[PDB]
């Protein structure tokens, strides 16, 4: 059959994952549960046959899994886009886990209680791993080179997030705020953002703060 | 050269890349800083080329890395080790990501205040995640199959670490406990662990709770 994907009805971890795919012309239906089917859920949780069920799961009549990192490198390595032999593939992966740590450190918090607490202490050292990206698309087109790579999704992401925090840590940083507009300028890209399947809110789970 | 790696002088992510390079009967340095040298990297910090540089680094001469996950990946890489095809691959992303679940679980707090607090809310969660684990090492050797793979290794950290926090977490999953055993049931692993050049302390930095 046609890709099936699944994870709840927000952006959390997925979204990455959904530009990609979108970027790819890729065919795939969307399971989406709501903040009351937090239920519907708990129960299909194990009829699925994933050895480690969780969310986002992906479902591709070839493979199941869980864990969406694993996810979208699955995506991407469908496409050579994963690398070309050690050094590169270690290097997206560099790229990867840099675009974590804005994003988890996105998250570490925002489900807490001292928010308006802690992202000053997330603010102060936040500037120190963006520029590092800056200094990336100096003289780079994306992340990588011309063509595209997942990590440059991943990374469209903790950007329209933090924009959400305070829409004034990109100023000083003009090319990211470049890298948006080049992202969003992708015709398969624009499609979504402008439809019914792209999910606006929230960032995060509904509960969050 | 031969390889130099690179992190403070505890466990916290660079381990699972230490057992794996040891079981492969690799040649490395170790560049070991301080509970007081926090400053004597502070230094080098950009010194060494590193496009994005943070903690653990790697330099093979080949290539400069950071990203502790993208390390490992890339000692993996150079043996095979890393899959053999798209599904394969996903798969030990799956794996991988899965065996991160337990371990940042566990220090997402640590570092906090609320730890007694918020362990409870933890350890009621733990087991879920630790049996899924026990019913892939039922009828298999290793989390793949009868060859190592590093998830492997980077369980048996998230293992030698709660352990720590409660010795019985384990009982109710006797697979496991014989999964940590074999693994330290590894000449190489022996050889390692009983040495100088092993860190018993502590799991995190020195700062933490
Ligand atoms: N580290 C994540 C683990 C997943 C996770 O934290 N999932 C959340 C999304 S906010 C979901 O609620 N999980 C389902 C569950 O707890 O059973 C991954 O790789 O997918
Ligand atoms: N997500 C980690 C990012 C690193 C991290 O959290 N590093 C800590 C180790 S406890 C270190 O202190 N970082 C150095 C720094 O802040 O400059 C990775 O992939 O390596």
Redesign the interface.
């Given at each position: 059959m046609s890709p099936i994907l699944g994870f709840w009805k927000i952006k959390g971890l997925v979204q990455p994952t959904r530009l990609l795919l979108e970027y790819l012309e890729e065919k795939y239906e969307e399971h989406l549960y709501e903040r009351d089917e937090g239920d519907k859920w708990r129960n299909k949780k194990f009829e699925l046959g994933l050895?480690?069920?969780?969310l986002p799961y992906y479902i591709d009549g070839?493979?199941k899994?869980?864990?969406?990192?694993?996810?979208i490198?699955?995506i991407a390595?469908?496409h050579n886009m994963l690398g070309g032999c050690?050094?590169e593939?270690?290097?997206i992966?560099?790229?990867?886990?840099?675009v974590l740590?804005i994003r988890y450190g996105v998250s570490?918090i925002a489900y807490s209680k001292d928010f308006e607490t802690l992202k000053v202490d997330f603010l102060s050292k936040l500037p120190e791993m963006l520029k590092?990206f800056e200094?990336?698309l100096c003289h780079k087109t994306y992340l990588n080179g011309d063509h595209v790579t997942h990590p440059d999704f991943m990374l469209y992401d903790a950007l329209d997030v933090v924009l959400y925090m305070d829409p004034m840590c990109l100023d000083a940083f003009p090319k990211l705020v470049c890298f948006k507009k080049r992202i969003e300028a992708i015709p398969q890209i624009d499609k979504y953002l402008k439809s019914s399947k792209y999910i606006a809110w929230p960032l995060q789970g509904w509960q969050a703060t």
């Open positions: 050895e480690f069920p969780n070839d493979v899994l869980t864990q969406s990192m694993a996810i490198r699955y390595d469908k050690p050094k593939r270690a290097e992966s560099m790229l990867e886990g840099a740590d570490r590092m200094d990336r």
